[PDB]
């Protein structure tokens, strides 16, 4: 035509993980601890550096009834032949074979205002069970996980919302690694 715009030239083989937002219960110890001013969230995935899987910003600890919002999204390549080791890491996890017994663990960490690593403290953990995504066959957006106290790994201190796009790829990995 030339009512034509010129456009120059430019997966179940990837997973996306978003750390969406979190809240703490008002009675949780972290909420009365004045030394805990701001938090971030991290997880460790296979051999990716931790610097790539932490929320890039720390946010003020929420007040009662407030949520803080990170919206930190990370796409992890899981190409069937270049990302064999990541795919097998995920397979072991689906089979409940890892330290966390089939869960991807998110850690909430207190960040001092001066950002000194040696004074960071783990405030709580949230566990996401991968097998569930495999079984359900779909991805839940803003899935809410309990954040549990580091003291017993059981008493809730808050709630962490995450979204994973992973069903398509966990399903391809499970298929591949049980018979291919």
């Amino acid at each position: 035509d030339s009512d034509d715009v010129i456009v120059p030239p430019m997966d179940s083989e990837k997973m996306c993980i978003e750390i969406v937002s979190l809240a703490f219960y008002p009675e949780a110890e972290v909420m009365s601890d004045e030394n805990i001013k701001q938090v971030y969230v991290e997880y460790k995935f296979y051999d990716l550096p931790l610097s790539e899987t932490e929320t890039p910003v720390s946010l003020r600890k929420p007040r009662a009834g407030e949520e803080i919002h990170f919206h930190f999204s990370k796409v992890i390549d899981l190409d069937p032949q270049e990302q064999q080791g990541r795919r097998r890491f995920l397979f072991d996890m689906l089979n409940g074979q890892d330290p966390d017994q089939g869960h991807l663990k998110f850690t909430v960490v207190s960040d001092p205002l001066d950002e000194e690593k040696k004074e960071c403290e783990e405030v709580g953990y949230a566990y996401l069970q991968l097998w569930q995504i495999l079984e359900s066959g779909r991805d839940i957006l803003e899935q809410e996980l309990d954040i549990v106290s580091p003291e017993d790994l059981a008493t809730p201190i808050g709630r962490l919302k995450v979204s994973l796009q992973a069903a398509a790829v966990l399903h391809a990995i499970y298929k591949e690694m049980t018979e291919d």
Binding site: D1, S2, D3, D4, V5, I6, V7, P8, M10, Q38, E52, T55, P56, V57, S58, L59, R60, E66, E67, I68, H69, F70, H71, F72, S73, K74, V75
Partner: protein, 364 residues
């Protein structure tokens, strides 16, 4: 083939173009001159006075005569005989102004926002026959079921939903044809946000009206009861020049500074990682060394262009709509330089619900 010296249009977020990866396009022997973005669609007016639409079309908001999303920027050929000058994109509708004196609208119409006298949706452009060549249109704006057209001589007309006072028509629930919203002074800028709106008078005053929630009208508490009439934000002392209104925030450009107010849970107030809401205007101290020439807001993010063509964005990072070009997205809580555009001069920007559109020209 080669990106022209005059530049390109870059799309970020879920624009419906190039499968929602950072996209780029331009025109054959033509150049963009005006961008606008609504909740899930976009309009580009070209120097040859053509209109190109893209994005969601489930309400007929692209004006292209169907209701299926359109991947590519697509000329509205029905308007080719006229010289299109401006467009505005709301949540599910679009307004267009032409040099001949006609204003048209298409899309959702449930509160009368098309200005056609009824509430039936349209999927092609229909004329709002109130406007004639005696209305020289300076600016169009459109929020969620709301519409505004501002003339060169300073008259402001608004229509559509007034359920929260957001077109400044007091206790009327909505209107389906344009009504002049006057506080008796000429207006030089207007912005329709999702559930509130604001305008700036030629003598530098800011008036705000609409839903009195989340601090976004910027008024002291004792005035929030009168949110259905435009009210002066007197806490900004110096002359205001522009205003842009988003989902739950407002951004104001003065001769001196940029101020924001409302709710910024995703960083869109640009006041840092501790302060997420303010019911009165606060200065973004963070960019006080730059001269800002242009401000734009989407539902949950904000863009600033400086006088030298740098751009800074802040707020909700989902889908890459901040325009920063990083492969990992994140909310940003202070204005952040789009250093992906350092070899360009950024000339126009519009921000939508899940996307942003940028016109930028290469230094070489």
């Amino acid at each position: 083939e080669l990106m022209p010296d005059s530049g390109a249009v870059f799309t970020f977020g879920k624009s419906k173009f190039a499968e929602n990866n950072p996209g780029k396009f331009w025109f054959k022997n033509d150049v963009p001159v005006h961008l606008s973005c609504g909740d899930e669609h976009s309009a580009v007016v070209t120097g040859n006075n053509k209109l190109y639409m893209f994005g969601s079309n489930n309400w007929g908001q692209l004006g292209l005569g169907s209701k299926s999303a359109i991947s590519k920027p697509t000329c509205v050929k029905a308007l080719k005989p006229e010289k299109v000058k401006l467009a505005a994109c709301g949540r599910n509708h679009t307004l267009v102004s032409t040099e001949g004196g006609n204003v048209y609208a298409t899309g959702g119409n449930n509160e009368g926002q098309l200005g056609l006298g009824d509430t039936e949706e349209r999927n092609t452009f229909h004329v709002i026959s109130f406007f004639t060549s005696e209305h020289k249109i300076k600016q169009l704006s459109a929020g969620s079921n709301t519409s505004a057209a501002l003339t060169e001589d300073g008259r402001l007309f608004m229509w559509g939903d007034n359920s929260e006072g957001q077109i400044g028509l007091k206790n009327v629930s909505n209107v389906c044809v344009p009504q002049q919203v006057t506080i008796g002074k000429p207006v030089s800028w207007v912005s329709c946000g999702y559930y509130h709106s604001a305008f700036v008078t030629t003598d530098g005053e800011l008036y705000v009206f609409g839903e009195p929630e989340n601090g976004k009208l910027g008024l002291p508490n004792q005035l929030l009861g009168n949110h259905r009439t435009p009210q002066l934000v007197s806490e900004i002392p110096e002359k205001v020049i522009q205003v842009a209104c988003g989902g739950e925030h407002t951004v104001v450009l003065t001769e001196n500074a940029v101020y924001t107010f409302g709710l910024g849970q995703f960083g869109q107030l640009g006041l840092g990682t501790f302060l997420f809401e303010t019911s009165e205007p606060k200065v973004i101290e963070n960019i006080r060394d730059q001269t800002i020439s242009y401000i734009s807001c989407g539902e949950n993010h904000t863009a600033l262009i400086t006088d030298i063509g740098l751009m800074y964005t802040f707020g909700d990072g989902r889908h890459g709509k901040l325009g920063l070009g990083l492969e990992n997205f994140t909310n940003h809580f202070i204005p952040t330089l789009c250093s992906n555009f350092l070899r360009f001069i950024v000339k126009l920007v519009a921000c939508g619900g899940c996307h942003m559109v940028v016109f930028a020209a290469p230094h070489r």
